[PDB]
Amino acid sequence: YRQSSATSSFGGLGGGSVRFGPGVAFRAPEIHG
């Protein structure tokens, strides 16, 4: 799940829902840049 986290603007105090593009939510694996 994508957390709203700190932001300049927000819907309200409650977490509510976050609108994100279609895909899957997986833990970030060990990757290299």
Curated annotation (Swiss-Prot):
The modification Omega-N-methylarginine is found at R2, R19, R27. Expressed in a defined zone of basal keratinocytes in the deep outer root sheath of hair follicles. Also observed in sweat gland and mammary gland ductal and secretory cells, bile ducts, gastrointestinal tract, bladder urothelium, oral epithelia, esophagus, ectocervical epithelium (at protein level). Expressed in epidermal basal cells, in nipple epidermis and a defined region of the hair follicle. Also seen in a subset of vascular wall cells in both the veins and artery of human umbilical cord, and in umbilical cord vascular smooth muscle. This is Keratin, type I cytoskeletal 19. Heterotetramer of two type I and two type II keratins. Interacts with PNN and the actin-binding domain of DMD. Interacts with HCV core protein. (Microbial infection) Interacts with hepatitis C virus/HCV core protein. Belongs to the intermediate filament family. The modification Asymmetric dimethylarginine is found at R19. This keratin differs from all other IF proteins in lacking the C-terminal tail domain. The gene is KRT19. There are two types of cytoskeletal and microfibrillar keratin: I (acidic; 40-55 kDa) and II (neutral to basic; 56-70 kDa). The modification Phosphoserine is found at S9, S17, E30. It comes from Homo sapiens (Human). Involved in the organization of myofibers. Together with KRT8, helps to link the contractile apparatus to dystrophin at the costameres of striated muscle.
